[PDB]
C-alpha cells in the first residue's frame, strides 16, 4: 500500500495523488565532503558539517478533479514560496519539500489523461540554555479573524501573530481602529479584525 | 442451440464501389498500440489505450490490371456479409484505405494467376450490426 | 478508556528484551515467597521473578534467579524447595460495636512466607462512617484503600484492587460496624519453610521436574556430596528414559584445587560440569556451586551455535587465581575454571568432567557445546519419533516420509551453518527385523566448531 | 493599499439606490469592489472613450468570432481573468466552469478570490 | 486412479455477463516479469518477482457484430468450467479486460466466418477452486 | 550545557510528590528531563497560550484526520520526534514500532536517546 | 417514537432515532434515561450547547447530532468531529465523561475552544456481551442499516418476479457479491463473504430465496497508546 499526499498549508488543500509513481521511487543521500591533498601524503577526505538538499523525482499520469484542474493547481503551487508537506506511505518518506520542476504531457491516444513528471526538493527554513528552534513553523490562519467572546486583543495577537505584544500592529490598522472602539482593551464578539501581513 | 453461422460465400466486397467478386479471401484488423506501464503500489500492471492503426489483407484471383492501374491512390472498401438462413446482414466500410505494395507480377507453372494485396486504412464505419 | 491520545514512559531496562533468547534451565530454589512444591516457568523477566518469589538476596531464589536471568536463558523452570512446616501469614480483624469484639474478617498472604506483612487501619478523617485500610510490608506501605463498613464489601475490596497480589481477605462473620482501628498488626503464624532444608527434599523437586522438559539442570548453590551423587544417578536414569539432561555442579567453598580435581576425576560423565573457582559480583562472594548457576545459564543460552570457550562473564573478581600450570591441571582434570584477564572474568575451553578417556572421537565429548548439540539433536529426533510411533503405517512410503522429514530437519540445521556435512539413511541392519511399532535409522554429522586457538609463526 | 468605498448601483433597476434622506446609499469597500467588477465586466474594451485601455473586457466581440467551442471557452476565461485582475484588490480568479445548455447558447461560472482571502502564516521570533 | 478430467464442452463463458456460447477456444495467462539477477557469492542466479500482466486470447465463430460494436471498451469475462462426471465447478472472472485489436473483417472461400479476439486484462478473481 | 533538575509530578495521581517535611520531592537532571518529555508529549501544540510554538505536539489533532494507517504512522513518528527533539538533552529519537491491535485502535513504541548515551573516541597525542 | 421505530424495524425499515433529555435533567437523570431504553437505534444527548449566543437544549442539539451522523454516512464517523457549537453545559470531568459514555449517553465536550463529540456511542451499552460490543456505536449501526436497506432494494426487484432456479439464484448472488465489491472499492470493508444459505434453501420456494453473509467493517481510528522507552 503506497500513497502520496501533498498537504499544502498556505492554500488549505490536501492533494492525494490518484495514481502511484509508475516504475519506481528513488532517493539519494550524499555526505558533504571535499578532498584535500597534503604534500608527500596524498588525498584525504574532510567532512563538512552541513547537510545536503536531496531530491525526490517520479512521474505519474492523471486519469479522467479533472486532470486540467489538478495540473493548474500544481503549477500554481510551483510558484509558492511556502513549503509543501510530502508524505509517502510505503516508501516511508515524510517531510517538508517544494517543487523544483513540474511538467504535463498529452499523448496521441488517452487525450483526456495527462502524463506528469514532477520533482521535489527537501525544504529547510532560515531562522535569521534553552530549547532548540528545530520545529517547522508551517501553520496558517485566515487573514481576517472573527472575535470570539473570551478573546482579548493581546490573546488575539499571541494566537494569530506570535509574540502576543504584537497587538498594536493589529490595532493601528485603520479598519481595525474603525471596527474596534477607541479603547483597545474593550472588544466585542463577532466583529471582524484583520491581522497584518 | 441453433444454426445461425455465416460463410464466406455470402461475402460481398465493393472495391471503390465496384464489385470485385473474384476475391476469395479478406481480413482486416483494427489494432491499438496499448501502452502497458507498471505502477509502484499495484502488483498488477496497468494498460493504457493508445491510437488505432487499421490494416487489411486482400488476396484473390487476377482477372484484370485493376490494382496495378490503381497504384497507391486512396480508395474505399465496403464489406457486406449477409445471413442467408435468416434475414439480416453486416456491412462495414473502410473509410480511407491505401495499398502497401502493388502485386505487380505473380505467376507459377500451370497454376492460376493469384493476386495478393496488403495495405492500411485510417478508420471505419459500422453500418449494419449483424 | 475514552477515545483520545494516551502516553506513558518506561525505562529501557523494562523493554521486552526476552525476544531472541534460547534454552531452558531448571532450579530447586529456596524461596521466601511464591508457590510451594510446584514448577513455574519465567520468560526471563526480572520483574516477573520479583513478583513470583520476592527480592530477598539472603534467600537463594532471587539471587540465583537473577544470575540465571543474566545468563540470557529463554525460560527458567523454578521449583520452590521447602523443608515443610509450611504456613502462610494470617491475621484476624474484629468488630467494634460488639463489646466482645467479634472476629469478622481473616486476612492471609497469597503464598507461604515469613516476611513481615502488616496491616494498619485508622479512622477515615473525611468520614467516620468509612475507614482507611492500609496494608504494609514491614515499615513500607504496600497498598491503601477506603471501604464501606459492611464486612462483605471490605473483603471484596481487599480482594479486588490491583495491588493485592500479596494478601487475600476472607470473612469470618458478618457485622454492621467497621473494623477496629489498628496499626501495623503483623500477619503472624506464617513460615517460608526455608529453615533447615532436608537432603531428601530435593528428590521431590527432581521428581516434579521429571514430567517437564528442559535442556539442563543445576543445583541450588549447595555442594553436598550426597546431593551431587543423587542428582548424578537421577540424570543417568533420565538419560535411560531418553531425556538428555545436562548437569552443572560446583565444589564446596573450602575445597582446594586438589579436591576439585579429585572430584572432577571421580565422576567424569560428559553430562556433568564442575566449577573450580569462586567469583564476586555486586561485592558479594559466590561459591562455585552458586557460580554453576550462571555457567549453566550461559551454556544453555548459547544453545547450538554459540559456546562459552572465551565468553566474558558478568563476574568482577575470581578466587583462586591460577597460573598457567594450574590452569592446565584443572582443565585436564575436567574442571571448568573462570580466569581473570585484564579486568574481565572469562571462562576457559568449555570443558566438562569427561576428560579421563578421550580415546578417539570421544575427545569431542569433553566440551559442553558438543554435548548440547548431541542432546538437542536427540531431543528433536525423539519429538519427531513420538508423532509416528504406532501411528503411521510401517511401509516403504512411510519410512521414506520419515527419512525425508529427518533430512529436511538436518537441512534446516545446515541453513544455520552449524554443520559442514551430514548424512541420514536407512539402517539396513536393524531394518531387517523391524516391525510396525518402531523403525530404525542411522546418521552422522560434522559439527562446525567455534574457533579456539591461533598459532602464528613470523618468518623474519 | 487604502482602498475606499462607493455608492450602490442596482444593476437590476439601472439606478442608484438612495436612502429616504435622498442621499445615495454608501457602501463598504468590498461592496464597491463587487460593483466595480460587474461594471468592468459589462464595459467593452477600447470602445468607451472615457476609459484607458486597461478598463473593460472584449466578451461581446468574441460572439462574432469563428473560433471553436473550447477555443471560445479559453478566450472567455482569459478575457474575464484579464479584465478582473487589473483591480489591486484581486488576488486570483479561476475555477471556471462551462455548460453549453442548448446547442449554441452557453452558461459559464467563475470564482473571484480577494486579497483578504489569503491565508497568513503564524510565527514570530 | 480414476477419471475426473474436464473437457471444453463444459466451458461456459459470460462476456460482460452475456453467454457467448459460440466461442470454441479460450486461453488466458497471468504472467510476471521475473527479474533474474546474478549475485557475487552464489553460483546459482537469483530470481526476483515483478509485476503481473494478464493476457487472453478468445476466438470462435462469428454470429453478429458484437465485438466490432464493442470496440476497445473495458468489459469483463467470466469463465466457468463445470465437472460433469462429479459435481463441482471452477469459475474465474477477468476483473478488467480490454481488446488489443478488433477483428473487423475476416473470411475466406466457403469457410465459416471465424473470429479471433486478443487482448489484455489487469487482474482476476478465483471464485471456485475445482 | 548546565541543565538543571526539577520536582517530581506523579502523572498517575496528577499531583506533586512531597516528602514528609512537606517540601516537594526534588529530582535529578535526567528525571526532570523525562518528566518534561512526558509533559510535552501530553501538551497539545498552538492551543495552550502560555507556551510558544516550539512546545507541544499535535497527536490529538491527527485522530480526526483522514490519512491512511501508514500515513498516520509516519505522522505520529514525525510529531513525536519533532516534539521531543527540541530539548537540548535529546540526541536522537527513533526505533518506532506500531501494533494495530484491534481494527482501529493502536499501540506504538519509541526509543529516546540522550546526549549522554553518545560514545566517545579515546585518543590523545 | 421508540415503539414506532421498533414497529418500522419489524416492517424492514431500519430507522435510527436520536433523542435528547429534558433541559432540567441532571447527569443522573440522563444516565437513568439512557439505561432505561438501551436500543442501538436510539441515541441520547447529554449536554446542552450554545450557538449564535442562543442556548440549545439537548433535544435541540440532537437535531444537529443526527444531521452529522447521517451526513457522515458509512465511511465517516463523529467520534471526534468538531461540532459547530461554541459552548457546552454541563462541562464534565473525565470521571463524569466515563460515567456518561458507559451509560450510553452521547456527550459533547469542550476542548480548546472546540466542542467535540466523544466516542460515537448510542444508548446500547447494557449488554455488550462480545461482538454485540460493536453495536454500541452509531457508525456500525448506520453501516448495518444501510446494507440492510440496499439488500431490501435488491430483494424487491426479484421477489416473485425471477424464476427460482439455480441460474436465478446464482444471478442474485452475483448481484449481491458485486454490490459488496463496490463497497470494497470504497475501502469500507476489509473482508466479506456471501454464499448460499443451504439450511434455509432446503425448504425455500418461488416467492423467496434465502442467503447468508458476513463482513469485517473498517473502523475509524479512535485512540492511540504510546510508550516512550528512555
Author numbering:
A (entry chain T): 2 to 65, 78 to 141, 154 to 222
B (entry chain d), E (entry chain Z): 8 to 137
C (entry chain e): 13 to 472
D (entry chain p), F (entry chain m): 24 to 148
G (entry chain g): 243 to 472
Sentences copied from the publication:
Here, we reveal the extended and contracted atomic structures of an intact contractile-tailed phage (φCD508) that binds to and penetrates the protective S-layer of the Gram-positive human pathogen Clostridioides difficile. Structures of purified φCD508 virions in both extended and contracted conformations were determined by single-particle EM of frozen-hydrated samples; the resolution ranged from 2.6 to 4.0 Å for the extended phage, and 2.9 to 4.2 Å for the contracted form.
Within the ring formed by the baseplate proteins lies the needle assembly; this is the other essential component presumed to be adapted for S-layer penetration. It is also striking that the needle spike protein lacks the β-helix observed in other CIS structures, and instead, the OB-fold is connected directly to the metal-binding apex domain. The terminus of the φCD508 needle is an apex domain as reported in other phages; it displays a conserved hexahistidine motif coordinating a putative iron ion. However, the notable feature of φCD508 is that the needle lacks the otherwise widely conserved β-helix. It is currently unknown as to whether there is an advantage or requirement for this compact needle, but homology searches for other needle spikes lacking β-helix domains find widespread examples in phages infecting distantly related S-layer–producing bacteria. It is striking that we find no obvious auxiliary domains with structural homology to peptidoglycan hydrolases in any of the φCD508 baseplate or needle proteins built to near completion within our cryoEM maps.
